[PDB]
Each structure stands twice: as C-alpha cells, then as structure tokens.
Design a binder for this molecule. Structure first.
Ligand code: HEC
Length: 104
C-alpha cells in the first residue's frame, strides 16, 4: 500500500466530492474522517441514502477494496456517482492513503 500513489489517486478521483481532514466540510459526499472501524452512514450531519443505511457494514480494508471496485454493485442505489477503480494496486494504494489521512 503506497500512500503517496494513493494520495495522488484520491485527488484525481475523490477530492472533488470528499474531504479527509478531521472537521473537514461535507461536500457532495460526506467527510471521510473516522472512516475506518466505523459503520456505514455514521458521519455526523451528512444526509445519506436509505441504500447506504441498509448496507450496515464496518468500513475497513476488505469492505473498501470491494466497494471502490464498483460502488453501485456493492451498495445498490447509492448516490455516489463513481464508476469504480478496477486495478488492485490503485485501490490498495488509495486505501493506504485513506488509512493515514482519515485517522487524524
Ligand atoms: C462525487 C462525484 C463523488 C466522488 C467522485 C466520489 N464519491 Fe464517495 N461518496 C459520494 C457520495 C454522494 C456519497 C454518499 C453515498 C450515499 O449513498 O449516501 C459517498 C460515499 C462514500 C463512502 C461511504 C461513506 C460512509 O458510508 O460513511 C466512501 C467510503 C467514499 N464515498 C469514498 C470515496 C472514494 C475513496 C472515492 C474516490 C476514489 C470517492 N468516494 C469518489 C460522492 C462521491
């Protein structure tokens, strides 16, 4: 998990909809601080879909590896309009970046 490659992926593919800093503002998508070890639909103040609430999983490496390959397939009906990342390494590198940036 290369975080520098993952940071560069996050800017290209997520940064327009997401922030990672603690106390970062909600944008189109929720602020991602505290993502790891947290159930879905748990960012305070963000309006999720009923689909995201119906999932009810714990966000970690394995659930993020499968979600980011195809979000519509993992959480059907989600309003996150992202096609997905096909390459293992980009998802693994991006998750390595998320593990450091979202944990303050
Ligand atoms: C807008 C154009 C987005 C882009 C690009 C990315 N995301 Fe996203 N994300 C967006 C929305 C609107 C939502 C809410 C989904 C819903 O149904 O309510 C999300 C959600 C997530 C989540 C789940 C957060 C949670 O369950 O608490 C994660 C983990 C997430 N987004 C990550 C993520 C990554 C890693 C992205 C790029 C690689 C990315 N998102 C792109 C909006 C948008």
């Amino acid at each position: 998990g290369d975080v520098e490659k993952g940071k560069k992926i996050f800017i290209m593919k997520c940064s327009q909809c997401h922030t990672v800093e603690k106390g970062g503002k909600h944008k189109t998508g929720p602020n991602l601080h505290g993502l790891f070890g947290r159930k879905t639909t748990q960012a305070p103040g963000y309006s999720y879909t009923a689909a995201n609430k119906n999932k009810g999983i714990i966000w970690g490496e394995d659930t993020l590896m499968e979600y980011l390959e195809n979000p519509k397939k993992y959480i059907p009906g989600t309003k996150m309009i992202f096609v997905g990342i096909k390459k293992k390494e980009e998802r693994a590198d991006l998750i390595a970046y998320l593990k450091k940036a979202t944990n303050e």
